[PDB]
Paper text:
The domain composition of SARM1 includes an N-terminal peptide, an ARM-repeats region, two SAM, and one TIR domain, which mediate mitochondria targeting, auto-inhibition, oligomerization, and NADase activity, respectively. Subsequently, studies have demonstrated that SARM1 is also a key part of a highly conserved axonal death pathway that is activated by nerve injury. Here, we present structural data and complementary biochemical assays to show that SARM1 is kept inactive through a ‘substrate inhibition’ mechanism, where the high concentration of NAD+ stabilizes the tightly packed, inhibited conformation of the protein. In this way, SARM1 activation is triggered by a decrease in the concentration of a cellular metabolite NAD+, rather than depending on the introduction of an activating factor.
For cryo-EM imaging, we generated a near-intact hSARM1 construct that lacks the N-terminal mitochondrial localization signal (26ERL…GPT724) and has a point mutation in the NADase catalytic site (E642Q). We first collected cryo-EM images of the purified hSARM1E642Q. 2D classification and 3D reconstruction revealed an octamer ring assembly with clearly visible inner ring, which is attributed to the tandem SAM domains. Only a minor fraction of the particles (~20%) shows the presence of a (partial) peripheral ring composed by the ARM and TIR domains. Exploring different buffers, pH and salt conditions, addition of various detergents, as well as variations in cryo-EM grid preparation (e.g. ice thickness) did not affect the visibility of the octamer peripheral ring considerably. As it became clear that the compact two-ring structure is inhibited for NADase activity, we considered whether the purified hSARM1, that was not subjected to GraFix and predominantly presents just the inner SAM ring in cryo-EM 2D averaging and 3D reconstruction, is active in vitro. Using a resazurin fluorescence assay modified for an in vitro application, we measured the rate of NAD+ consumption by hSARM1w.t. in a series of NAD+ concentrations and determined a Km of 28 ± 4 µM, with Vmax of 9 ± 0.3 µM/min and Kcat of 46.49 1/min. We therefore measured the effect of NMN supplement on the NADase activity of purified hSARM1 and found a moderate 30% increase in activity with 1 mM NMN, but none at a lower concentration of 200 µM. This demonstrates that the purified hSARM1 is mostly NADase active, even without NMN supplement, supporting the idea of a predominantly open conformation as seen in cryo-EM.
Author numbering:
A (entry chain F): 402 to 545
B (entry chain G): 404 to 548
C (entry chain H): 400 to 545
D (entry chain A): 404 to 546
E (entry chain B): 392 to 548
F (entry chain E): 402 to 547
G (entry chain C): 401 to 548
H (entry chain D): 403 to 548
């Protein structure tokens, strides 16, 4: 079935490899192995890195990949890196927002600091690309 | 007739559709690229040209003509809780095509009032200004709770 | 010497009628490209400079100008009844007969008489393909009254 | 004499004119490209260089010098219902050359007042700012 | 009485009617100024008085084959002298030459540029900075500013 | 004798070499040696230098590298070059900010000067790329006792 | 009248330019300067671009050495033939080093009376004064000049 | 460990000796070929170092500038520095002494310094650190004149 609370931030190369198999991306196992992609790097993967460093030339294939990564990010356990439980805060707003947890905690944001965050920061620093999402997160952050 | 549940389509249903619209030539590319319903609905000019090998702008226009038809008469119920499809359709039947674009950003009826022109263009993929403006206008004259 | 039929239902034209028109206007040389690219009425009415150069192989700007001269004539005298419920054709024509050529551009965006008042300059240029500023300005002005 | 009806010229008359002005070398290109009166009047720098193969900027300048003459002394009556030709000419004989530019956008005397500087440049092909400004000024005060 | 125009250095004739010059007179002038090397190019391209007066950096480099910026500068130095002392009577009905000359003798060189756009004394008051640069080919800002200033302070009533 | 926090500013080529081995970047030992990277240069290393001069072509590899370097920078002993103890000031704000110490002291900033620092300075001169971090550091700097 | 102290560079011919190149250790470039027909006027107006592309001086360092010599020459040159209003002494009074800008200003037809109206853009683009510090000083002093 | 070296007056030979002392003998040939003397050494840019002197590595350039900054910090500028800007800059911060030649080359002195802008200190005088620019500017506005 579908894995329950995987601790992706603490994943090692081997766990990333397993996940690539499960989602039907075995073709890319070699690249990910050579590049030594662990949990931290997987969560922070960009379009650019995927295309140039991991050899995923097709925009459609990349879209499929990010579709899977988004799913993983949505259901991951962030407890090692998420002391204030931003995951649950984001999830309460909309389950789909949970995917942004690692982006926020990687900049050192927590519940208490969230109120002061700017739109630019959510886009550039936290990697929230959808305006709709940014706006909703911003709004809710100002009112808690 | 029956409206196809394109959001839930798999590669095989996409392959069938390509045949029906006279694009059998492209079946192999779509198979290789593993285009399912979700990816079909979200297909861009760029992806069509570069990743699927549809070099001609005219051919791409023909393709989008067919895709727009499909999108107009698709069943979105699995992914469209608030029934944005009918809201769009009531404005103009041709706007139903934008359903998946809106629900893919997590918009629904309640959130629609707050949407910006930039958001409709960049996030939702509504390319025609005329359409954007009409959708924006009608969204502001909704229920604001 | 005007191509026959006059007052044609270009929106409903198929490849064959496009082919016939190309012959009549002395562009037989391009029949093959139009055939290969499967240009019908709808696509002919929406044809761009870019598509004409790249996809249909009309390399000369002067040849493209000759082509658009003919296409403008066709668009000016075409029957748009199937696709133009609000009769934008007559509205445009009343302003200036030459403006009737913009009918398909306006109806293809889903504009009609009632919506026209709200249209912007950007919309007329980008969405409706009205390239001449003079024309855009006149159409815009008249739209803001109705 | 009588001014030639350049708007109605066919390929053959364009060919004749090229010979007369000493541009015989370009007859073949003009023939291949099927340049008639309408296209001759609307010819751009770009078309002349790329489509007609006139590589030299100096040669193009010589060509436009001849074309401007032709435009200045052409008969526009078929296409110029409101006689913009005479209006332009009265301002400055040299402005008659812009007749076809204006009538091709569907302008006439009555509409002229509403024209903008951008429109005269982009739509009508009036490249000299000085000329644009004078035509604009006079158009607003006939209103 | 600083008249070096009666000097041996200065190309003959003095006060030439350059607007009416034909290829042959252009050829003669090239010889006098030590640009014989370019005679062939100018002949081939059929440069007459009107084209000589209107010549641009671009035409000089690409169409006439003068690849060096320094050589072009030398050329324009000579052309500016010619333009400064030329007779513009055929083309300058309102005597813009004298108007420009009264401001500064070296501004007379702009005469053909101004009359070529259809400027005259009466119209000069309305001229813009853009027009002097793009239409008249006055490249030096200092010159543009002085001409502009003087034009705005003209009596048109 | 072994110190807890390493004195990276005083490191020589040999200590840099050792560190590369420990973090699994032995592959790059040669490049670092040829380029004569010491502690000072290691602390000041940029993306560009890492790619072009040290031959680390992969953006993923560079990310792994900087992940290790950030840790080193966070826990380094800066006492030789940090007379006013900006390290502890930054650390008090957030332990993760200690990584910016060498950036600040390399421009000649100290506690007394910190109040005057601008956003542009923190970005261009000090190399603080994260907006969130800049803003927090800036805020705290303005509200200091001069 | 045989040897002058301050050289009349504006009136120099090719031959005097050639001699100067030899003296400053740039004999290697004599042929290029000869071929390009560089006289005093052109020497004084030489740009970075012309020096690199037309005269073949590829190195930025070599160009810097060249301009170091040219700046000296420009600073001490006699401009009397072309400088009626004595802008040279005006510039010199501000700072001796600013005398090097004389030919740049007189070549645009500036003089003392016109100086008050000059703009920063003009000093940079038309007169070739590249150092902002120099432009600012010249601009400041020019604001206290009397115009007509 | 040179005491007050008169770098502005240095000839090719002294620059060569200096290169040897700092472990850059590899670059002696290029510096010789390009005829780098004291004046050119003090005014050297990243661009000239890369393109004209063949120092391809950014890291090597950084090492070089580290040495040059040291030399500039300890140099005797008396030939070119009549108002003793060197001591004024040094009194502010010993690390500012390195900017002496940049300032005096533009003809600046103690009395003029106040009129300089931040852009001028960057573009004309080659002061790359914003923090340094701002500190020099501030102190210049508050100084005692005659």
């Amino acid at each position: 079935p579908r894995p329950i609370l995987p601790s992706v931030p603490s994943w090692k190369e081997a766990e990333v490899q397993t996940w690539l198999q499960q989602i039907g991306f075995s073709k890319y196992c070699e690249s990910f192995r050579e590049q030594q992609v662990d949990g931290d790097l997987l969560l922070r993967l960009t379009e650019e890195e995927l295309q140039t460093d991991l050899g995923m030339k097709s925009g459609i294939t990349r879209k499929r990949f990010f579709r899977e990564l988004t799913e993983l990010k949505t259901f991951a356990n962030y407890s090692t890196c998420d002391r204030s439980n931003l995951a649950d805060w984001l999830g309460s707003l909309d389950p789909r927002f949970r995917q942004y947890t690692y982006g926020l905690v990687s900049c050192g944001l927590d519940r208490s600091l969230l109120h002061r965050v700017s739109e630019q920061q959510l886009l550039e620093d936290c990697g929230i690309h959808l305006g709709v999402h940014r706006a909703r997160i911003l709004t809710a952050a100002r009112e808690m």
